[PDB]
Amino acid sequence: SELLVNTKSGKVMGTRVPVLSSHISAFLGIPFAEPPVGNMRFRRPEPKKPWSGVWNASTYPNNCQQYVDEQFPGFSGSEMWNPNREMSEDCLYLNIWVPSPRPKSTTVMVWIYGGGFYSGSSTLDVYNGKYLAYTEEVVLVSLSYRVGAFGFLALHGSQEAPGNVGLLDQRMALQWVHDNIQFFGGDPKTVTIFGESAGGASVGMHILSPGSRDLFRRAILQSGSPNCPWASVSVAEGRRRAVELGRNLNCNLNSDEELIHCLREKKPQELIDVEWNVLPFDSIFRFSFVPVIDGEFFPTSLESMLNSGNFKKTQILLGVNKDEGSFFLLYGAPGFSKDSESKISREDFMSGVKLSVPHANDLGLDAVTLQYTDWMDDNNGIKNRDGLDDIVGDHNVICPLMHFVNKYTKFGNGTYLYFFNHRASNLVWPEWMGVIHGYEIEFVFGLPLVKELNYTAEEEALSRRIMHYWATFAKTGNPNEPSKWPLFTTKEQKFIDLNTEPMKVHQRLRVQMCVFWNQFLPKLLNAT
Ligand SMILES: *[C@@H]1O[C@H](CO)[C@@H](O[C@@H]2O[C@H](CO)[C@@H](O)[C@H](O)[C@H]2NC(C)=O)[C@H](O)[C@H]1NC(C)=O
Ligand SMILES: *[C@@H]1O[C@H](CO)[C@@H](O)[C@H](O)[C@H]1NC(C)=O
Ligand SMILES: *[C@@H]1O[C@H](CO)[C@@H](O)[C@H](O)[C@H]1NC(C)=O
Structure with missing residues (x-):
């Protein structure tokens, strides 16, 4: 059978x-x-x-x-x-x-x-x-x-x-x-x-x-x-959060063995009910238990x-969406909400930044702010909202991925880089959230071929280029069938968009911002 x-x-x-x-x-x-x-x-x-x-x-x-x-x-x-x-x-x-x-x-x-x-x-x-x-x-x-x-x-x-x-x-x-x-x-x-x-x-x-x-x-x-x-996180920080976890359940904290024993007697939902209490900062896009x-x-x-x-x-193929940060701001930054255009006041902006870069001293917060503020229009709520969105997405997803790809390419055997930016026509999340974290998945998995789901036909088509790129790349180490997705090289830094409009090739994906997050800010916080 x-x-x-x-x-x-x-x-x-x-x-x-x-x-x-x-x-x-x-x-x-x-x-x-x-x-x-x-x-x-x-x-x-x-x-x-x-x-x-x-x-x-x-x-x-x-x-x-x-x-x-x-x-x-x-x-x-x-x-x-x-x-x-x-x-x-x-x-x-x-x-x-x-x-x-x-x-x-x-x-x-x-x-x-x-x-x-x-x-x-x-x-x-x-x-x-x-x-x-x-x-x-x-x-x-x-x-x-x-x-x-x-x-x-x-x-x-x-x-x-x-x-x-x-x-x-x-x-x-x-x-x-x-x-x-x-x-x-x-x-x-x-x-x-x-x-x-x-x-x-x-x-x-x-x-x-x-x-x-x-x-x-x-x-x-x-x-x-x-x-x-x-x-x-480092082993110190993981250790610190494990203990704090224990401290939230009144565990005996006098030895690792004592602590683990107490955690092992607890119902699953007890651990979950207090998991968030151990973050060391007030912060958005941070999670309690992650690799060490x-x-x-x-x-x-x-x-x-x-x-x-x-x-x-x-070979590796990888990429990001145009608006990675909006989810995390919706779930936690003041000023943002599911059913409003979420226009953000100067005061709310300032606290968004502090929540997004939780490990920064006041001087670092000043630099993030200077970097993301149109000073000839500092009271525009759309601009504040979008700048905050870019801060979260740049710092947490795009600039780190660009760093990784830049280092990977020096020794790897082929890199292909995408920028996914089609907003689904059937999306139930508000307009301001943009092309959201998580929403390229349904294209990669081909949901737009089921009609009951209500995608346009140009969306079904895009889903098919994506699956065929992913699969052809998996089968051969190149997403191209023998209009090109060029290789990303350390010299030229090319990538593509992924959307219904015909594809274009671009270069140096968010370099200006990623030089700030990958080179400048780290240096500034090492020194102060
Ligand atoms: C990935 O590695 C393959 C195989 O090692 C590379 O192909 C070789 O290229 C070298 C350098 O030009 C040639 O001398 C050989 O003729 C090739 N060997 C084989 C077995 O084809 C390929 O260039 C690499 N691709 C990338 C983008 O790094
Ligand atoms: C396990 O398979 C049987 C047939 O072998 C079937 O009734 C069912 O799909 C499975 N069991 C359930 C209902 O969890
Ligand atoms: C597609 O369209 C219908 C009719 O408006 C909508 O109610 C339906 O729920 C959509 N399908 C899904 C599951 O979204």
Whole structure:
């Protein structure tokens, strides 16, 4: 049977699913680790003990325990990101979509979801692999991995909660693909990993970690990079936040062992109810438990790894959206709201900046402000709102990604860079938010080919160029079929737009602002 597949861990059974008036196979909720429950919480994951009999991979798995967005109850723009399945600590599962009939040795793509490391699911409507699998004829995997404190609580020195274990979940799912994807028609020596926001950062991190490098061929990074200022923390800061976590639950804090024990007796939702209380600053685009620079997963600092070429040398394709910052301002900066044009007063601007660059002294805040203010029009609310938007997106997503790409290109084997800027015609979020964090995903996953969803036809077309670029790049290391997407080179710095208008090629993507965030501001804060 096409739906029966024998693997190194045991036999697995899927289900046919319809797709654009056809069918393909899906193997959903296949385990790739032991359940990290009980005395195993905060622990490195363990390989799943094989089973006999036939694994029922006919329905989606649980989602990992996570914080749930309730800012806009009943609003689909936010609610479609929340878990749509029971949450549980038993969540290390992966999902495969296989073309029909079964390929013999086709290109494999493994999706890693984002969510600032505090949230995410493999099972969401926008991550449905059937459209991609079917249209581009690739085997589509999506893995899953522990988030929040379950995935990233870090007491360096302990072996009970070493940190990074979420990153280790990902690696195991990738071990399992390397090992078993052949039986599903996938080619394990042509796996592309790809992800968005924390998933984009994750991909960069697997490119840097020596223990992950041999497990995939190429990489795609959407709106996220390993060196993002929100994507990792030192062992001191992780230790400090773990303890503070404990302090919020009245734990015995006299030893690592005492503390971990107390955290392990707590119901999942107790950890989640206080997770946000440990940020050391009042801040937007910052998350409590994220990877740590431990000297193990990351052997030294990301920056020295990047300067010295200590990382997997291969092809990568990556990019950003035009308005990355607006979500975070909506959720936290005063002046902003879902149902108003959100025009921002000088006073609210000043506090936006302080929230966006939480680690800056007054002199740094002055410099961000000078840099983003039209002084011949300082009382324009649209200008204040948009400048704040650019500050969040430049500092947190674009300038870090440009730094990474600039360093990667000096040693890598080919880079392709995009700037995604089409606002969907069916978008339910307000006009002022722009081309928003997270909204290229539905193009990359091909949702605009389902008519019930209400995209224009030029949107269906764009979605098809994107999938074919992503897939062709995954299959060959070049998104071009033999009008060009040129290579990004350190000399010329070219990239493309991605939108309904015919494509153009540009250069030096936000250099002016990124020289400020990557060279000047860091220097200024080192000195003062
Ligand atoms: C990626 O690496 C490939 C393979 O190593 C490079 O192709 C080589 O280019 C060198 C330098 O010009 C030539 O001497 C060889 O003939 C090529 N070798 C092979 C096996 O083709 C390729 O240039 C690299 N691409 C980029 C953009 O760096
Ligand atoms: C498991 O598969 C059976 C058929 O083998 C099917 O009834 C169902 O899709 C699965 N179980 C449920 C309902 O969770
Ligand atoms: C497409 O159009 C209809 C009719 O206005 C709208 O109500 C419907 O919900 C749309 N489809 C979705 C799920 O948005």
